[model samples]
Target: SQRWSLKAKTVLVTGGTKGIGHAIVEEFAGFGAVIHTCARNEYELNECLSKWQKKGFQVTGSVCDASLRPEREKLMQTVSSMFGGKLDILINNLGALDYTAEDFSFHISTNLESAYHLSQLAHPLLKASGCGNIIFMSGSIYSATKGALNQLARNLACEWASDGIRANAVAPAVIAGEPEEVSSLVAFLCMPAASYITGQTICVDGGLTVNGFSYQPQ
Candidate 1:
């Protein structure tokens, strides 16, 4: 069996302490990628980092709330120094799933704005990698901002193609899949084998959102 490797790659995953983001960090680290991640909770971040350290994975993390602009800037700065200004993959995986009537702005900042800013900040390094990959994780609308994210991926894919960077978005089905299922797709999309796939909103829905199937005789 032939296996693809991300051994030489350097990756950054936001909100990597829990849920989908955590799975992504683990998946990339398992494949030998050097990883830098962040989360708002210091305790959780340290816990995950400790586990990764014990396993001898090249993983490190900092405390960050992705919704904040200053924190995002600081995070990218740290990643720049640690990764030496070259990043092969960027996972804008930080997200907000719950919302209230007064949480509209909070939702947008956490889910949409964070990705926009991080992608912008990582652009130079991604270009430097010469085969950069960017993945955006989205949920439904409102708190999810999935619509805007799909459009963002299309625009980025078009704009960054000349820079040798590929951009895509992932929309996982609600409650029908595990975090690993989503992370598996995320990991695959970062590989060189998936280089030609870009500007796509690939769904991991377990047929829950599939349209009616029609049979055609050949």
Candidate 2:
């Protein structure tokens, strides 16, 4: 038992005001982690911000359209400051399930570019923490933008190993558990006990991806 609790961690869960992201927030909040979340909806952000405050949770949140690279960069700047020049964990929880010219573009930017840019921005701070973790996730189109995300996490895991940072990704079963089920897996991945684990795209789909991976016996 190598400190499964996140008592002293500074966490950022992007798009954490609704659906799966919200669950991640409450789960981490239960562990007494300092949570910072974001959303494009100002009203949604305020609602959770107020609720968490009333419950006495350490929460800092704001509104940001992640499609814009500048806004993504600005968010990391603010987050780095909020956490005092260091970030312990970063959960790349931003995404959507719509399809259209505009919707697709938004999805690519929010699900893909946002996470990539945040990794770049947060790496220095994460490296400074000495025990940093980054988690990526997606709701649908597993191979769409998330393909790149998986590669990104794997590459980061290798590159940041020297800095003591671990990177991994997760995908949940389609139309299944919307929030907590997925959050639980992500929570475990964030723990210090999983310190030796890195560079993986794990599916929290209850055996759905079990057979997708190789089990060859030579």
Candidate 3:
């Protein structure tokens, strides 16, 4: 009924049953999207899907380890089924704090590989929509410049420009511990009105990226 209306549009957001991912899921669900999300925890996936299914929203999801290519494939297989083989949008939201080398590998997969693999799998479907979009969320190696991730978005935007797909990644900084505030920005970019913006690393960091010059002594 409107330009921003996401009603019945098929969408997928990773790690979407909790944390920042959870907030983003809620926002799109409110906009009436036929939303799909996947989590590593089966219990949480079932619980979240059950909660929304009872409400009659066309939300569906699977327990998927986004880092694992096989899992990513199966997860989207379910999504394709739900949306009848075409995808409208995809949000690759992943990451958490450090744990070990094992942790390092896991975070790398979520922070980087998953976005690539999922976009690859969903590429055909997204192109078919003619307004497909892809977004990657931040976190992992704060010392590592966001360009590590942003570079992909920058290139993907160029390579896929002709395909009507926009790719962007957020360099994140939390705002006062509230998830909703971070989630809102991704929600806006998902809308049809956001078509012209693409290929840049955006920060919702509340000046964290721009506070140059020290205080408290210097």
Candidate 4:
């Protein structure tokens, strides 16, 4: 058991079948959170859920392509059913990393709108839970959209503070950090231990963004 357990808390993680999202779902479940997750691929989603079940983790999921508004809405509806209308945490991890002329809108929709719309949909439940935590993973995005997300987290923290909701963004830099490294930080942000911290974009890069003046000692 973790020193700070999220025992009995309800969590919803998007794009949770693999990568950073997968690690996050496992991390929360390890701390005893009743987790609900979604992935576009039903087969992969089922496989992940089954593995978690084998490990005695209470996790369930649905097939949801979060880029579409209808799918995002339906995903939240599923959460209402699975968690009994109450939600403690939401991890907006479904995103796109493709870079192309035609992929602009796709990137914006999946990486930004999904997070915005889902957060709005989960607002009431989060406000009611008394320990609402929303984390936006900056693993993939458009440059402007990523900036917008960071600003959105700050704004959400400011406005939702009265509701006792804390929002933050985790930005991973050039290193392509190990999934567990990002997952641990994310788990901390959702814990009661991180109650006092919010509205900040904490980077998980290994000094990549701050090495502008580094001197190698060879």
For residues 1-218, what per-residue lDDT tens digits would candidate 2 score against the true structure? 44788886999899899878898998888888999899999898999999998887888997887768888888888898889989999998867645667776666656777788888899999988999999987724445677777888899999999999999998776434454578888888899989999998876543333557733211
lDDT of 2: 0.83
Q: Which candidate would rank higher by TM-score, 2 or 4? A: 4
Residue-wise C-alpha lDDT for candidate 1, range 1-218, written one tens digit per residue? 12367885899998888888888888888888999999878988889999888987889898887788999999999999998999999999856556564576567656777899999999999999999999998623342477778888999999999999999988776446374668988999888888898998876654433366633211
Residue-pair clashes per prediction, in order, are 0, 0, 0, 0
Q: Write the per-residue lDDT of candidate 3 for residues 107-148, one digit (tens) a residue.
A: 654567777888889888788888998887763444342546
Compute the lDDT of residue 119 as modeled in candidate 2.
Answer: 87
TM-score of each: 0.88, 0.86, 0.85, 0.88
Residues 1-218 of candidate 4 have per-residue lDDT tens digits of 45377898899999888878888999888888899999888999889999999999999999988878999889999998778788999998847455675566567655777888999999988988888999998623456667788898999999999998999998665545364568888988998888998998876555433357753211
Error of 2 at 16 (Å): 0.8
Report the Cα lDDT for residue 89, model 4.
96
**Candidate 3: lDDT of 6?**
82
